[PDB]
């Protein structure tokens, strides 16, 4: 690795210039191949430096200090590179010791709606660039969808929980900057049927294998067979899974049919032989009597009488020859039928017990996408695949909130401030907010730019919770309706004693019906204290929100009793139940590529808004309204690192707009 590993850790190809780089350095990428490799090295080496020590600012001076010839010969190239990497949050992002104390006076004013990770990330960057930044948060806390329950020694995340690998993950840097206790997740997940009995390794492995094979099959349907539109409606993943299962049940029958069809052909071939044998035994029976009657003519006899005896003798042994050759055939076909009837093809494709364990695997997928598989886009639901990180997944053992809180330090954050209206014009913006506690107490905020990090669910509200003046353009609003915003809930169970397998991190529960496969289907053991965490996914997620905490905790204990013993499961000391769809500051959990949407909508969401001119015939205005957030980052949607990066992205785009890009020359 070394320099090339730093490029990978920064999600960049080590030996090629990116599209963004082509924009900022068009002189180099269009120039000779030699210069490009110098550029690439400088970029990579600077990245390495920052990465190797991400707790202190990396200045231009410090960078040039540690470069060789001919890489330190051109100092304006080094400066252009450093500035670029600093602007777009590739270096000097998050929480680091600043060498040169912040600029004495600020330039430009930005209001940031929401203090979730994306908002916070962007805020820190803009403040780093010397801008006046104020965040407006409706909640009485930072972090938004990164929520962490804390009470006594109990620590459990109701929101974001898992770091999906450190290989190229920006959160890898963050974790070195903040005291995050990152614990690996053990892959093994024992299942337990409705009765409370564990699924045997026989079934467990051979149902899961079928699940993975069913997915690959849908991918084959999508890409190879091009099965993507059905009656004008776009085909969902759920639709395609049904179609694949049906075709697998069909094949099972097709096999059985042509197997018994093999039997009737041989059985009916045997029928014809038996008829021939019966008709020959009939003629033998007759011929014997004739030969017998011929031998009643005792010698001496004339020659014709002698001939008759000899004739009938020959004729009989000839027919006895045939019958024995037919009894030879009879023996062969008779065992050929014991052959085919001994090894029948598969009885069923999947049994009722199988189809239930397979439903758990669907529930798992419904949890991962926070949505019923009938809503996911077949073609695109997994479009962000290529950009997944390497390394084992980890959990934040001390609670994920430690991250937003750390980012929130040294920032102007107005909590309990619900943005009601965004007004943007050629000359600037005003944001109208209210106090969440006394809703008549009104605030007005004037700024050069607004960065909107409102959750997609919020942007989807009907009627609007936030009004845009002027209304957002058709292309933007259509993107909002097209896109999917899913739901997923957590049940926190705090006990006085560990009654589960301590070496097992997670164990499943198989529901009775397809309709309730998501309901409390998975349990997490991750924390120091005895806490069990139960997921509600799929269609079940939305319905469990209309049910009281007691009943939910009820069904939780019921299940846990069934697995570990009706007396080994004590009453929970503390319980929490999330309701993300109900939560007015989220209106759901995270986004999914809905059927009829694509990854391209995510781009549309990230595109800023430029108002019309005040005076007609006045020059084209500056862009005023900007969008960051988990639903704006095509390559990392529905995640923390995705939000984090989207924030960094807009902060760069905004600073370029209002402070100017000095590095492009």
């Amino acid at each position: 690795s070394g320099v090339e590993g730093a490029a990978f850790q920064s999600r960049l190809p080590h030996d090629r210039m990116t599209s963004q780089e082509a924009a900022c350095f068009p002189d180099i990428i269009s120039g000779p191949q030699q210069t490009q490799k110098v550029f690439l090295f400088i970029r990579n080496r600077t990245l390495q430096l920052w990465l190797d020590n991400p707790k202190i600012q990396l200045t231009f001076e410090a960078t040039l200090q540690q470069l060789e010839a001919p890489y330190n010969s051109d100092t304006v190239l080094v400066h252009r590179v450093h500035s670029y990497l600093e602007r777009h949050g590739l270096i000097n992002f998050g929480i680091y010791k600043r060498i040169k104390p912040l600029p004495t006076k600020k330039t430009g004013k930005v209001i940031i709606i929401g203090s979730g990770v994306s908002g916070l990330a962007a805020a820190r960057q803009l403040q780093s660039f010397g801008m006046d930044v104020t965040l407006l948060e409706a909640r009485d806390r930072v972090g938004g969808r990164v929520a962490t329950f804390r009470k006594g020694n109990y620590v459990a995340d109701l929101g974001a929980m898992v770091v999906t690998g450190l290989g190229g993950n920006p959160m890898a840097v963050v974790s070195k900057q903040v005291n995050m206790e990152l614990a690996k997740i053990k892959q093994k997940c024992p299942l337990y049927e409705a009765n409370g009995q564990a699924v045997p390794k026989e079934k467990d492995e051979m149902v899961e294998q079928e699940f993975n094979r069913l997915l690959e099959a849908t991918s084959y349907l999508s890409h190879q067979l091009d099965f993507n539109v059905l009656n004008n409606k776009p085909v969902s993943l759920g639709q395609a899974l049904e179609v694949v299962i049906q075709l697998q049940e069909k094949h099972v029958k097709d096999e059985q049919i042509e197997h018994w069809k093999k039997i009737v052909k041989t059985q009916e071939e045997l029928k014809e032989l038996l008829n021939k044998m019966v008709n020959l035994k009939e003629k033998i029976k007759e011929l014997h009597q004739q030969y017998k009657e011929a031998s009643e003519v005792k010698p001496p006899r004339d020659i014709t009488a002698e001939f008759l005896v000899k004739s009938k003798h020959r004729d009989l042994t000839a027919l006895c020859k045939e019958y024995d050759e037919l009894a030879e055939t009879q023996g062969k076909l008779e065992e050929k039928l014991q052959e085919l009837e001994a090894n029948p093809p598969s009885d069923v494709y999947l049994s009722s017990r199988d189809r239930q364990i397979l439903d758990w695997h669907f529930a798992n997928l419904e949890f991962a996408n926070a949505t019923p598989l009938s809503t996911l886009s077949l073609k695109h639901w997994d479009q962000d695949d290529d950009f997944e990180f390497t390394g084992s997944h980890l959990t934040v053992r001390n609670g994920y909130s430690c991250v937003p809180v750390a980012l929130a330090e040294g920032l102007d954050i107005k909590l309990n401030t619900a943005v009601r209206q965004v007004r943007y014009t050629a000359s600037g913006c005003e944001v109208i907010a209210v106090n969440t506690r006394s809703t008549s107490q009104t605030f007005i905020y004037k700024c050069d730019a607004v960065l909107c990090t409102l959750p997609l669910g919020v942007l989807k509200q009907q009627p609007p919770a936030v009004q845009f003046v002027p209304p957002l353009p058709e292309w933007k609003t259509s993107a909002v309706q097209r896109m999917g915003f899913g739901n997923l809930n957590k049940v926190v169970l705090c006990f006085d004693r560990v009654f589960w397998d301590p070496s097992v991190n997670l164990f499943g529960h198989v529901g009775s019906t397809t309709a309730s496969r998501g309901e409390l289907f998975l349990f997490w053991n991750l924390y120091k204290a005895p806490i069990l965490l139960a997921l509600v996914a799929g269609e079940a997620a939305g319905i469990m929100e209309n049910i009281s905490d007691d009943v939910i905790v009820g069904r939780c204990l019921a299940i846990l009793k069934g697995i570990f013993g009706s007396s080994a499961v004590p009453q929970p000391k503390e319980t929490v139940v999330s309701r993300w769809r109900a939560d007015p500051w989220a209106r759901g959990s995270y986004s999914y590529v809905a059927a009829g949407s694509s990854g391209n909508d995510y781009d549309l969401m990230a595109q800023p808004i430029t108002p019309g001119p005040s005076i007609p015939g006045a020059p084209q205005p500056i862009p005023r309204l900007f969008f960051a957030g988990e639903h704006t980052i095509r390559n990392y949607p529905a995640t923390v690192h995705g939000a984090l990066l989207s924030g960094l992205r807009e902060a760069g785009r905004i600073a370029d707009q209002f402070l100017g890009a000095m590095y492009t020359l």
């Binding site: 997940c189 798992n364 991962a368 639901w381 997994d382 962000d384 997944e388 998975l522 999914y592 949607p637």
Partner: peptide
């Protein structure tokens, strides 16, 4: 996303 898949 697929990433969360247990």
């Amino acid at each position: 996303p697929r990433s969360f898949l247990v």
